[model samples]
Target: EKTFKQRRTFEQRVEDVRLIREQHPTKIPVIIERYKGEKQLPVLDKTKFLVPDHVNMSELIKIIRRRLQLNANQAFFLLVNGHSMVSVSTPISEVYESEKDEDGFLYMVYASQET
Candidate 1:
Protein backbone atom coordinates (compact mmCIF):
# COMPACT_ATOMS: atom_id res chain seq x y z
CA GLU A 1 0.00 0.00 0.00
CA LYS A 2 1.19 3.51 -0.70
CA THR A 3 1.97 5.85 2.16
CA PHE A 4 -0.60 8.62 2.67
CA LYS A 5 1.56 11.26 1.00
CA GLN A 6 2.10 9.18 -2.10
CA ARG A 7 -1.59 8.41 -2.15
CA ARG A 8 -2.43 12.11 -1.96
CA THR A 9 -0.89 12.82 -5.34
CA PHE A 10 -3.30 13.74 -8.12
CA GLU A 11 -3.32 10.49 -10.06
CA GLN A 12 -3.68 8.46 -6.91
CA ARG A 13 -6.46 10.66 -5.61
CA VAL A 14 -8.35 10.21 -8.86
CA GLU A 15 -8.08 6.45 -8.57
CA ASP A 16 -9.14 6.49 -4.95
CA VAL A 17 -12.11 8.69 -5.73
CA ARG A 18 -13.17 6.31 -8.45
CA LEU A 19 -13.03 3.49 -5.96
CA ILE A 20 -15.00 5.42 -3.36
CA ARG A 21 -17.62 6.45 -5.86
CA GLU A 22 -18.00 2.88 -7.02
CA GLN A 23 -18.56 1.84 -3.45
CA HIS A 24 -21.11 4.49 -2.56
CA PRO A 25 -24.26 2.89 -1.20
CA THR A 26 -26.79 4.74 -3.29
CA LYS A 27 -27.46 6.82 -6.37
CA ILE A 28 -29.56 9.84 -5.40
CA PRO A 29 -28.22 11.78 -2.42
CA VAL A 30 -29.56 14.00 0.29
CA ILE A 31 -28.28 17.50 0.98
CA ILE A 32 -24.64 17.58 1.98
CA GLU A 33 -24.15 18.62 5.58
CA ARG A 34 -22.08 21.71 6.26
CA TYR A 35 -19.39 21.39 8.90
CA LYS A 36 -18.44 24.43 10.97
CA GLY A 37 -17.27 23.28 14.41
CA GLU A 38 -17.59 19.56 14.81
CA LYS A 39 -15.27 17.12 16.50
CA GLN A 40 -15.06 13.43 15.78
CA LEU A 41 -13.31 10.39 17.14
CA PRO A 42 -10.38 8.97 15.27
CA VAL A 43 -11.27 5.83 13.42
CA LEU A 44 -9.42 2.81 14.66
CA ASP A 45 -8.04 -0.33 13.25
CA LYS A 46 -7.14 -2.92 15.82
CA THR A 47 -3.43 -2.66 15.09
CA LYS A 48 -3.17 0.96 14.01
CA PHE A 49 -5.47 2.53 16.55
CA LEU A 50 -4.08 5.77 17.94
CA VAL A 51 -0.64 5.28 16.54
CA PRO A 52 1.48 8.37 17.10
CA ASP A 53 2.44 8.49 13.44
CA HIS A 54 -1.14 8.49 12.25
CA VAL A 55 -2.18 11.25 9.89
CA ASN A 56 -4.07 14.34 11.10
CA MET A 57 -6.05 17.21 9.59
CA SER A 58 -3.42 18.68 7.31
CA GLU A 59 -2.59 15.27 6.00
CA LEU A 60 -6.25 14.49 5.65
CA ILE A 61 -6.73 17.68 3.65
CA LYS A 62 -4.09 16.56 1.19
CA ILE A 63 -5.82 13.25 0.86
CA ILE A 64 -9.19 14.88 0.36
CA ARG A 65 -7.87 17.21 -2.31
CA ARG A 66 -6.40 14.33 -4.21
CA ARG A 67 -9.47 12.16 -3.98
CA LEU A 68 -11.70 15.00 -5.10
CA GLN A 69 -9.44 15.78 -8.06
CA LEU A 70 -9.19 19.37 -6.83
CA ASN A 71 -6.36 21.44 -8.17
CA ALA A 72 -4.17 22.94 -5.45
CA ASN A 73 -5.98 26.25 -5.74
CA GLN A 74 -9.45 24.85 -6.21
CA ALA A 75 -10.15 23.43 -2.79
CA PHE A 76 -10.29 24.34 0.90
CA PHE A 77 -11.88 23.32 4.21
CA LEU A 78 -14.80 23.80 6.61
CA LEU A 79 -14.82 23.06 10.31
CA VAL A 80 -17.69 20.75 11.09
CA ASN A 81 -20.39 22.23 13.28
CA GLY A 82 -21.21 20.54 16.56
CA HIS A 83 -24.42 18.84 15.49
CA SER A 84 -25.39 15.27 14.68
CA MET A 85 -25.73 15.88 10.94
CA VAL A 86 -22.37 14.19 10.66
CA SER A 87 -20.30 12.75 13.43
CA VAL A 88 -18.28 15.34 15.24
CA SER A 89 -14.90 16.01 13.52
CA THR A 90 -15.59 13.89 10.51
CA PRO A 91 -12.86 13.97 7.87
CA ILE A 92 -13.79 15.45 4.55
CA SER A 93 -14.82 12.52 2.41
CA GLU A 94 -12.83 11.51 -0.65
CA VAL A 95 -15.88 12.73 -2.48
CA TYR A 96 -16.59 16.39 -1.72
CA GLU A 97 -20.02 17.95 -2.10
CA SER A 98 -19.17 21.59 -1.50
CA GLU A 99 -17.84 24.32 -3.73
CA LYS A 100 -15.85 27.29 -2.49
CA ASP A 101 -16.95 30.51 -4.15
CA GLU A 102 -14.58 32.71 -6.15
CA ASP A 103 -13.46 34.74 -3.16
CA GLY A 104 -12.29 31.40 -1.69
CA PHE A 105 -13.66 32.12 1.77
CA LEU A 106 -17.20 30.77 1.72
CA TYR A 107 -18.39 27.35 0.64
CA MET A 108 -21.80 26.09 -0.34
CA VAL A 109 -23.00 22.60 -0.90
CA TYR A 110 -23.80 21.70 -4.51
CA ALA A 111 -27.46 21.34 -3.55
CA SER A 112 -27.66 24.97 -2.42
CA GLN A 113 -26.52 26.23 -5.81
CA GLU A 114 -28.89 24.13 -7.90
CA THR A 115 -31.98 26.25 -7.57
Candidate 2:
Protein backbone atom coordinates (compact mmCIF):
# COMPACT_ATOMS: atom_id res chain seq x y z
CA GLU A 1 0.00 0.00 0.00
CA LYS A 2 1.12 3.52 -0.72
CA THR A 3 2.26 5.67 2.19
CA PHE A 4 -0.03 8.49 3.40
CA LYS A 5 1.82 11.21 1.53
CA GLN A 6 2.16 9.02 -1.56
CA ARG A 7 -1.54 8.25 -1.68
CA ARG A 8 -2.58 11.87 -2.13
CA THR A 9 -1.30 14.89 -3.95
CA PHE A 10 0.18 17.73 -1.88
CA GLU A 11 -2.79 19.94 -2.63
CA GLN A 12 -5.34 17.34 -1.58
CA ARG A 13 -3.42 16.60 1.60
CA VAL A 14 -3.38 20.24 2.62
CA GLU A 15 -7.13 20.43 2.13
CA ASP A 16 -7.64 17.23 4.08
CA VAL A 17 -5.73 18.63 7.04
CA ARG A 18 -7.56 21.90 6.94
CA LEU A 19 -10.94 20.21 7.11
CA ILE A 20 -9.83 17.80 9.79
CA ARG A 21 -8.38 20.52 12.00
CA GLU A 22 -11.24 22.89 11.46
CA GLN A 23 -13.76 20.24 12.49
CA HIS A 24 -11.74 18.94 15.40
CA PRO A 25 -9.43 21.63 16.69
CA THR A 26 -8.37 19.77 19.83
CA LYS A 27 -7.13 16.64 18.12
CA ILE A 28 -3.81 16.02 16.43
CA PRO A 29 -4.01 13.93 13.27
CA VAL A 30 -1.30 11.38 12.75
CA ILE A 31 -0.29 8.31 10.77
CA ILE A 32 1.42 5.33 12.32
CA GLU A 33 3.07 2.38 10.58
CA ARG A 34 5.61 -0.31 11.16
CA TYR A 35 9.11 0.61 10.03
CA LYS A 36 10.26 -0.94 6.75
CA GLY A 37 13.07 -2.91 8.34
CA GLU A 38 11.05 -4.14 11.31
CA LYS A 39 10.33 -7.86 11.29
CA GLN A 40 9.62 -9.00 14.83
CA LEU A 41 6.81 -6.66 15.79
CA PRO A 42 3.31 -7.19 14.51
CA VAL A 43 1.76 -4.49 12.35
CA LEU A 44 -0.79 -2.18 13.95
CA ASP A 45 -4.36 -2.90 12.92
CA LYS A 46 -5.14 0.81 12.66
CA THR A 47 -3.04 3.50 10.97
CA LYS A 48 -4.80 6.80 11.61
CA PHE A 49 -4.71 8.37 15.05
CA LEU A 50 -6.47 11.47 16.33
CA VAL A 51 -4.82 11.94 19.67
CA PRO A 52 -5.80 14.75 21.98
CA ASP A 53 -3.56 17.81 21.78
CA HIS A 54 -2.82 17.79 25.50
CA VAL A 55 -1.72 14.18 25.56
CA ASN A 56 2.01 13.62 25.92
CA MET A 57 4.14 11.31 23.80
CA SER A 58 4.78 9.02 26.78
CA GLU A 59 1.07 8.41 27.10
CA LEU A 60 0.78 7.80 23.38
CA ILE A 61 3.56 5.25 23.44
CA LYS A 62 1.93 3.42 26.30
CA ILE A 63 -1.26 3.18 24.29
CA ILE A 64 0.62 1.90 21.26
CA ARG A 65 2.48 -0.63 23.37
CA ARG A 66 -0.74 -2.00 24.77
CA ARG A 67 -2.40 -2.09 21.37
CA LEU A 68 0.52 -4.10 19.99
CA GLN A 69 0.53 -6.43 23.03
CA LEU A 70 4.27 -6.15 23.32
CA ASN A 71 6.16 -8.06 26.00
CA ALA A 72 8.09 -6.54 28.89
CA ASN A 73 11.47 -7.27 27.35
CA GLN A 74 10.83 -5.83 23.92
CA ALA A 75 12.49 -2.55 23.00
CA PHE A 76 10.11 -0.45 20.99
CA PHE A 77 10.86 2.87 19.33
CA LEU A 78 8.76 5.37 17.43
CA LEU A 79 10.46 7.53 14.82
CA VAL A 80 8.92 10.69 13.47
CA ASN A 81 9.07 10.73 9.65
CA GLY A 82 11.04 7.51 9.95
CA HIS A 83 14.01 9.38 11.41
CA SER A 84 13.88 11.73 14.45
CA MET A 85 12.90 10.10 17.72
CA VAL A 86 10.08 11.73 19.65
CA SER A 87 10.57 13.07 23.14
CA VAL A 88 8.23 11.50 25.65
CA SER A 89 7.92 14.72 27.60
CA THR A 90 6.42 16.83 24.83
CA PRO A 91 2.69 17.22 24.32
CA ILE A 92 1.18 16.02 21.04
CA SER A 93 0.07 19.55 20.20
CA GLU A 94 3.59 20.95 20.50
CA VAL A 95 5.12 18.29 18.30
CA TYR A 96 2.40 18.66 15.72
CA GLU A 97 3.15 22.34 15.38
CA SER A 98 6.88 21.75 14.82
CA GLU A 99 6.91 18.49 12.90
CA LYS A 100 3.71 18.37 10.89
CA ASP A 101 4.46 17.65 7.25
CA GLU A 102 4.01 20.15 4.45
CA ASP A 103 1.02 18.11 3.38
CA GLY A 104 -0.27 18.28 7.02
CA PHE A 105 -0.36 15.08 9.14
CA LEU A 106 2.37 13.96 11.48
CA TYR A 107 3.72 10.55 10.38
CA MET A 108 5.41 8.04 12.61
CA VAL A 109 6.90 4.57 12.15
CA TYR A 110 7.52 1.97 14.84
CA ALA A 111 10.62 -0.21 15.03
CA SER A 112 12.01 -2.78 17.43
CA GLN A 113 15.44 -4.17 18.12
CA GLU A 114 16.20 -7.92 18.14
CA THR A 115 14.67 -9.63 21.13
Candidate 3:
Protein backbone atom coordinates (compact mmCIF):
# COMPACT_ATOMS: atom_id res chain seq x y z
CA GLU A 1 0.00 0.00 0.00
CA LYS A 2 1.17 3.56 -0.79
CA THR A 3 0.05 6.89 0.59
CA PHE A 4 -0.64 9.95 -1.53
CA LYS A 5 -0.55 13.64 -0.63
CA GLN A 6 -3.82 15.16 0.46
CA ARG A 7 -5.38 18.00 -1.48
CA ARG A 8 -6.63 21.05 0.39
CA THR A 9 -10.29 21.91 0.08
CA PHE A 10 -11.49 25.28 -1.17
CA GLU A 11 -12.49 26.37 2.31
CA GLN A 12 -9.13 25.33 3.65
CA ARG A 13 -7.40 27.38 0.98
CA VAL A 14 -9.52 30.42 1.85
CA GLU A 15 -8.72 30.00 5.52
CA ASP A 16 -5.04 29.78 4.70
CA VAL A 17 -5.29 33.01 2.75
CA ARG A 18 -6.95 34.69 5.70
CA LEU A 19 -4.25 33.51 8.05
CA ILE A 20 -1.55 34.79 5.72
CA ARG A 21 -3.24 38.17 5.42
CA GLU A 22 -3.44 38.45 9.17
CA GLN A 23 0.24 37.62 9.54
CA HIS A 24 1.46 40.05 6.90
CA PRO A 25 2.40 43.57 7.92
CA THR A 26 0.51 46.55 6.50
CA LYS A 27 3.50 48.85 6.28
CA ILE A 28 7.14 47.89 6.03
CA PRO A 29 10.16 50.13 6.13
CA VAL A 30 13.18 49.22 4.05
CA ILE A 31 16.64 50.64 3.61
CA ILE A 32 17.71 50.85 -0.01
CA GLU A 33 21.44 51.18 -0.44
CA ARG A 34 22.76 52.23 -3.80
CA TYR A 35 26.13 51.19 -5.16
CA LYS A 36 28.26 51.02 -8.33
CA GLY A 37 27.11 54.21 -10.06
CA GLU A 38 24.88 56.82 -8.46
CA LYS A 39 24.66 60.55 -8.10
CA GLN A 40 24.36 62.25 -4.70
CA LEU A 41 22.81 60.35 -1.86
CA PRO A 42 19.06 60.67 -1.30
CA VAL A 43 19.17 61.86 2.30
CA LEU A 44 20.88 59.65 4.81
CA ASP A 45 23.52 57.17 3.69
CA LYS A 46 20.66 54.95 2.64
CA THR A 47 17.24 56.01 1.48
CA LYS A 48 14.32 54.90 3.62
CA PHE A 49 11.08 53.77 1.97
CA LEU A 50 7.84 52.70 3.55
CA VAL A 51 6.03 50.19 1.40
CA PRO A 52 3.00 48.02 1.79
CA ASP A 53 3.89 44.46 2.66
CA HIS A 54 1.85 43.23 -0.29
CA VAL A 55 4.03 44.98 -2.86
CA ASN A 56 5.97 42.65 -5.18
CA MET A 57 9.55 43.05 -6.32
CA SER A 58 8.37 44.29 -9.73
CA GLU A 59 6.34 47.10 -8.22
CA LEU A 60 9.21 47.98 -5.90
CA ILE A 61 11.59 48.18 -8.84
CA LYS A 62 9.31 50.58 -10.65
CA ILE A 63 8.97 52.73 -7.54
CA ILE A 64 12.73 52.87 -7.07
CA ARG A 65 13.35 53.68 -10.71
CA ARG A 66 10.82 56.53 -10.66
CA ARG A 67 12.14 57.97 -7.41
CA LEU A 68 15.72 57.83 -8.65
CA GLN A 69 14.88 59.15 -12.12
CA LEU A 70 16.50 56.19 -13.78
CA ASN A 71 15.71 55.76 -17.45
CA ALA A 72 14.23 52.49 -18.71
CA ASN A 73 17.41 51.57 -20.57
CA GLN A 74 19.55 52.08 -17.48
CA ALA A 75 20.55 48.69 -16.17
CA PHE A 76 20.43 47.82 -12.46
CA PHE A 77 20.20 44.81 -10.21
CA LEU A 78 18.45 44.39 -6.90
CA LEU A 79 20.01 42.02 -4.43
CA VAL A 80 19.02 40.69 -1.05
CA ASN A 81 21.34 39.05 1.51
CA GLY A 82 24.23 40.20 -0.73
CA HIS A 83 24.01 37.02 -2.81
CA SER A 84 20.49 36.63 -4.18
CA MET A 85 18.88 38.49 -7.02
CA VAL A 86 15.19 38.91 -6.24
CA SER A 87 12.77 37.99 -8.99
CA VAL A 88 10.39 40.66 -10.22
CA SER A 89 7.16 39.02 -9.07
CA THR A 90 8.25 37.72 -5.66
CA PRO A 91 6.57 39.35 -2.69
CA ILE A 92 8.92 41.68 -0.86
CA SER A 93 7.33 40.87 2.48
CA GLU A 94 8.53 37.31 2.14
CA VAL A 95 12.08 38.48 1.59
CA TYR A 96 11.85 40.76 4.62
CA GLU A 97 10.34 37.97 6.67
CA SER A 98 13.31 35.71 5.98
CA GLU A 99 16.33 38.02 5.79
CA LYS A 100 15.64 41.11 7.89
CA ASP A 101 18.19 41.81 10.61
CA GLU A 102 17.71 43.04 14.19
CA ASP A 103 17.10 46.62 13.06
CA GLY A 104 13.76 45.56 11.51
CA PHE A 105 14.62 47.18 8.21
CA LEU A 106 14.79 45.15 5.00
CA TYR A 107 18.19 45.63 3.40
CA MET A 108 18.21 45.96 -0.37
CA VAL A 109 21.09 46.91 -2.66
CA TYR A 110 20.84 48.36 -6.15
CA ALA A 111 23.94 47.92 -8.27
CA SER A 112 24.21 49.84 -11.53
CA GLN A 113 26.62 48.58 -14.15
CA GLU A 114 27.87 45.61 -12.16
CA THR A 115 30.43 44.09 -14.45
TM per prediction: 0.26, 0.88, 0.63
lDDT per residue as tens, model 3, 1-115: 1111124344654454445446654766676676534554232233556678788877887877777777888876666666545466767777678776454556677766541
Order of models, best lDDT first: 2, 3, 1
Q: What lDDT tens digits, residue by residue, belong to model 2 across residues 1-107?
A: 77766777889878988999999999999989898767888988777789999888788888888999999788888778656444778899999988888878998
Per TM-score, what order, best first?
2, 3, 1
- Clash pairs detected, candidate 2: none
Question: TM-score for model 1?
Answer: 0.26
Report the poorest 10 consecutive residues by lDDT, candidate 2. 79-88
Candidate 2 positional error at 21, Å: 0.6
The runs of at least 3 residues in candidate 2 whose Cα sits more than 4 Å from the true structure, single-residue gaps closed, are: 84-86
- 2-109 in candidate 1: lDDT tens per residue? 333333465654454455446653321112222323223221122111111233335544554464455665434523222112332333331233421222111222
As a whole number from 0 to 100, the lDDT of residue 113 in candidate 3 is: 50
lDDT against true structure, model 2: 0.83
Q: Is candidate 1 or candidate 3 better by lDDT?
A: 3
In candidate 3, position 97 carries an lDDT of 80
